[PDB]
Amino acid sequence: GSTYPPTPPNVTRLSVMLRWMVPRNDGLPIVIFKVQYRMVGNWQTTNDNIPYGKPKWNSELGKSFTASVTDLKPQHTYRFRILAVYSNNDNKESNTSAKFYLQP
């Protein structure tokens, strides 16, 4: 089955807020998302397993999701990406986010 990738997350200050979207598509449904990050310059996965849940879409464009990441070391720049896990157990990563400096 086809695996439509989520968009990269837009990163804003909070801790870090990540907002991404799963565009409307007819591919396989998503079960959960995982959040990955790395310092600018190896990818690590946080412990959060974000459910796709309901509803299916929350706008004409698709479904937007907003979550947060905690306990990251400030005074460093990071990149983030969203891993989508599909109902057939395949998975696919979003493109990487823009760089984000975490202010102390």
Tab-separated table of C-alpha atoms in Angstrom:
chain	number	residue	atom	x	y	z
A	1	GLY	CA	0.000	0.000	0.000
A	2	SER	CA	0.994	3.632	-0.478
A	3	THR	CA	2.422	5.567	2.450
A	4	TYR	CA	1.741	9.294	2.188
A	5	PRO	CA	4.313	11.142	4.321
A	6	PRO	CA	3.411	13.785	6.890
A	7	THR	CA	4.758	17.283	6.283
A	8	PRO	CA	7.783	18.371	8.289
A	9	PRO	CA	6.811	19.925	11.611
A	10	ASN	CA	6.867	23.703	12.009
A	11	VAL	CA	8.894	24.368	15.162
A	12	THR	CA	8.120	27.113	17.683
A	13	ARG	CA	9.197	28.043	21.218
A	14	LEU	CA	7.244	27.040	24.333
A	15	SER	CA	10.104	23.328	25.478
A	16	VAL	CA	9.409	22.976	21.764
A	17	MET	CA	6.071	22.864	19.951
A	18	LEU	CA	5.803	20.805	16.762
A	19	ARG	CA	2.895	21.201	14.354
A	20	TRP	CA	2.676	18.964	11.293
A	21	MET	CA	0.041	17.837	8.819
A	22	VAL	CA	-1.050	14.647	7.112
A	23	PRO	CA	-2.455	15.859	3.775
A	24	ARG	CA	-5.685	14.251	2.590
A	25	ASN	CA	-4.809	11.089	0.700
A	26	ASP	CA	-6.080	7.639	-0.249
A	27	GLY	CA	-3.048	5.724	0.980
A	28	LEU	CA	-2.765	3.521	4.051
A	29	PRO	CA	-4.041	4.973	7.325
A	30	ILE	CA	-1.566	5.988	10.018
A	31	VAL	CA	-1.559	4.238	13.392
A	32	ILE	CA	0.880	6.398	15.354
A	33	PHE	CA	3.604	9.010	14.950
A	34	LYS	CA	7.001	9.146	16.623
A	35	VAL	CA	9.039	12.313	17.099
A	36	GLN	CA	12.701	12.372	16.150
A	37	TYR	CA	15.328	15.054	16.641
A	38	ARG	CA	19.034	15.681	16.258
A	39	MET	CA	21.463	18.527	16.810
A	40	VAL	CA	22.640	20.402	13.724
A	41	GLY	CA	25.701	18.905	12.062
A	42	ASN	CA	22.530	11.345	14.835
A	43	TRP	CA	18.749	11.049	15.011
A	44	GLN	CA	17.124	10.191	18.322
A	45	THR	CA	13.523	9.160	18.953
A	46	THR	CA	11.593	10.490	21.942
A	47	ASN	CA	9.345	8.256	24.061
A	48	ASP	CA	6.095	9.761	22.816
A	49	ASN	CA	3.830	7.557	20.702
A	50	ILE	CA	1.238	9.923	19.243
A	51	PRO	CA	-2.030	8.276	18.173
A	52	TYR	CA	-3.606	9.293	14.881
A	53	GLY	CA	-6.985	9.091	16.602
A	54	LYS	CA	-10.177	10.749	15.386
A	55	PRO	CA	-11.412	12.625	13.416
A	56	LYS	CA	-9.866	11.587	10.103
A	57	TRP	CA	-9.266	15.182	8.945
A	58	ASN	CA	-9.670	18.556	10.692
A	59	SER	CA	-9.572	20.824	7.630
A	60	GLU	CA	-10.004	20.663	3.862
A	61	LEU	CA	-6.248	20.165	3.552
A	62	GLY	CA	-5.928	17.140	5.838
A	63	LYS	CA	-5.251	16.607	9.524
A	64	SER	CA	-3.032	18.848	11.612
A	65	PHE	CA	-1.312	17.624	14.790
A	66	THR	CA	0.383	19.655	17.522
A	67	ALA	CA	2.591	18.138	20.218
A	68	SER	CA	5.507	19.214	22.381
A	69	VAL	CA	8.989	17.953	23.224
A	70	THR	CA	10.545	18.343	26.666
A	71	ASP	CA	13.888	18.304	28.461
A	72	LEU	CA	16.006	19.258	25.442
A	73	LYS	CA	19.343	20.939	26.175
A	74	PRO	CA	19.144	24.688	25.447
A	75	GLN	CA	21.861	26.709	23.677
A	76	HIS	CA	21.880	24.239	20.788
A	77	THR	CA	20.216	24.145	17.381
A	78	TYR	CA	18.063	21.161	16.431
A	79	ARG	CA	16.187	19.632	13.532
A	80	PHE	CA	13.027	17.558	13.930
A	81	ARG	CA	11.069	15.092	11.852
A	82	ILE	CA	7.915	13.048	12.232
A	83	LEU	CA	7.856	9.294	11.690
A	84	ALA	CA	4.502	7.924	10.558
A	85	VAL	CA	3.745	4.242	11.218
A	86	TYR	CA	1.070	2.789	8.928
A	87	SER	CA	-1.548	0.059	9.450
A	88	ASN	CA	0.552	-2.437	7.464
A	89	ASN	CA	3.516	-1.854	9.795
A	90	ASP	CA	5.549	0.065	7.222
A	91	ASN	CA	6.707	3.541	8.194
A	92	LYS	CA	7.935	6.713	6.536
A	93	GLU	CA	9.567	9.911	7.780
A	94	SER	CA	8.519	13.455	7.016
A	95	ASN	CA	11.157	15.662	5.435
A	96	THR	CA	13.289	17.353	8.091
A	97	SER	CA	12.220	20.583	9.749
A	98	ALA	CA	14.064	23.870	9.443
A	99	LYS	CA	16.812	24.444	12.011
A	100	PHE	CA	15.619	25.582	15.436
A	101	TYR	CA	17.769	27.157	18.131
A	102	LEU	CA	16.529	26.455	21.650
A	103	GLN	CA	16.946	29.646	23.695
A	104	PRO	CA	17.877	29.280	27.404
